[PDB]
């Protein structure tokens, strides 16, 4: 019983970087997605694999909230079957994803004069990420034929890069907060249902 605690995920003071995206398990509560939709003015609210009309009537074993911060024009990469730096090295969704992606502009919170360098993203990687994979490795990336031996030289790049979010920029470069809800339905008592 009792409403699902979405507050600590969406209203949270701090959000993680895209390469270290945060995950939260939600269960044993009733989810009212109309209240969540009308709780604020979101920029994107798109549900994949499930009809939004039939949302307050379903039941699932669990739900998982993945929260992070990206830039505007990268929001297109948070979707099944998308490519790009974020969709390959930071956060990956399966082709058969079932859930809902929500995103909203956060320039008033994640933009500082001179840029915000606290937010990073992975730039180089040897292989793509599997769906729902989280990589926090900081090993030196080998670019050339010479071995790196964990020394920051040339052809030996650090795999993470700063965003530098700045307020006066256009909305394409402005920081956006992204929360992805994934629905898990197993042979188990469904602990999340509509009203």
């Amino acid at each position, epitope marked *: 019983t009792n409403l699902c605690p979405f507050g600590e995920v969406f209203n949270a003071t701090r959000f993680a970087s895209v390469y270290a995206w945060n995950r939260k398990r939600i269960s044993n509560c009733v989810a009212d*997605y109309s209240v969540l*939709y009308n709780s604020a*003015s979101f*920029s*994107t*609210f*798109k*549900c*994949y694999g499930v*009809s*939004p009309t039939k*949302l307050n009537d379903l039941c699932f074993t669990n739900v998982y909230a993945d929260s992070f911060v990206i830039r*505007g*024009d990268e*929001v*297109r990469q948070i*979707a099944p079957g998308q490519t790009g730096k974020i969709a390959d090295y930071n956060y990956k969704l399966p082709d058969d994803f079932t859930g*809902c992606v929500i*995103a909203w*502009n956060s*320039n008033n919170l994640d933009s500082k004069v001179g840029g915000n360098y606290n937010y990073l993203y992975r730039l180089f990687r040897k292989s793509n990420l599997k769906p729902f994979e989280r990589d926090i490795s900081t090993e030196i990336y080998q670019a050339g034929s010479t071995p790196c031996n964990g020394v920051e030289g040339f052809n030996c790049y650090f795999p993470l890069q700063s965003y530098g979010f700045q307020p*006066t*920029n*256009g*909305v*394409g470069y*402005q920081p*956006y907060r992204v929360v992805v809800l994934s629905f898990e339905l197993l042979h188990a008592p469904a602990t999340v249902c509509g009203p």
Partner: antibody
Framework: EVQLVESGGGLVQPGGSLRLSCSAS????????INWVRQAPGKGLEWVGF??????????AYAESVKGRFSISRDDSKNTVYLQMNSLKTEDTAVYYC???????????????????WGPGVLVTVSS | SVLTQPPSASGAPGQRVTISCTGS?????????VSWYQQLPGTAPKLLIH???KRPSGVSDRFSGSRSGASASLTITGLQSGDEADYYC??????????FGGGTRVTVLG
């Protein structure tokens, strides 16, 4: 030839009702947001309303001058967006245009978007 | 909020004409990419500029767009007698949704 065509206009009495239909031709009609924009005779362009797609959580949003009187719906099986007008006033006499929203398709954020395809327009005259 | 546009913009044949669109900090001062559309006498509007800078294919390259602070500028180089039309600018706002400008009537001075 990608097309959008509106139909169902003409002369209506003050207080009457009328339904305009906008039909598409040559593209994925279920993937685009649809906007209705009107223009009074000899005046500027005024946004009337918009409707999202099936997989988008939300309801159509209207203008404050027509909120509670105009309704926007869609039928994907027939590729037609319907604009229903009830309790019509003489202020509603205008040319109505049906358009689609690209940029929302590519960037998926409300802050970025533009209209690329426009229909010829349909005249609605409210007089007695 | 109806973004303010000059009622007209004139120029001798071959000039460089500029049209300005002024908005609030809620729409043009917050990025919110601006769009520029053209309406010939008796026709439907046609998209000219999107994302304040980009030209769709087929649109002539004599049309340029820029954004500064809470204002936008559309520049037409090499003015032609065929460019005489009405021009509108459209932006999204957090409260009032889509807004259009007052319209600028371009005249080639004879």
């Amino acid at each position: 030839e990608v097309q959008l065509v509106e139909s169902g206009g003409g002369l209506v009495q003050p207080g009457g009702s009328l339904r305009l239909s906008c039909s598409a031709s040559g593209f994925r009609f279920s993937d685009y947001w649809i906007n209705w924009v009107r223009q009074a005779p000899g005046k500027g362009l005024e946004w009337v309303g918009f409707i999202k797609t099936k997989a988008d959580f939300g309801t159509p949003a209207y203008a404050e001058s027509v909120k509670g009187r105009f309704s926007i719906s869609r039928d994907d099986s027939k590729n037609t967006v319907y604009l229903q007008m009830n309790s019509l006033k003489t202020e509603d006499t205008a040319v109505y245009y049906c358009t689609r929203d690209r940029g929302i398709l590519e960037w998926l954020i409300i802050e970025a978007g533009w209209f690329d395809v426009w229909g010829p327009g349909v005249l609605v005259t409210v007089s007695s | 909020s109806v973004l303010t546009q000059p009622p007209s913009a004139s120029g001798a044949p071959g000039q460089r004409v500029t049209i300005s669109c002024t908005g609030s900090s809620s729409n043009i001062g917050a990025g919110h990419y601006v769009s520029w559309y053209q309406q010939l006498p008796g026709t439907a509007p046609k998209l000219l500029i999107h994302e304040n800078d980009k030209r769709p294919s087929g649109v002539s390259d004599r049309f340029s767009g820029s954004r500064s602070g809470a204002s936008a500028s559309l520049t037409i180089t090499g003015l032609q007698s065929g460019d005489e039309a009405d021009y509108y600018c459209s932006v999204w706002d957090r409260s009032l949704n889509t807004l259009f400008g007052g319209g600028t009537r371009v005249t080639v001075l004879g």
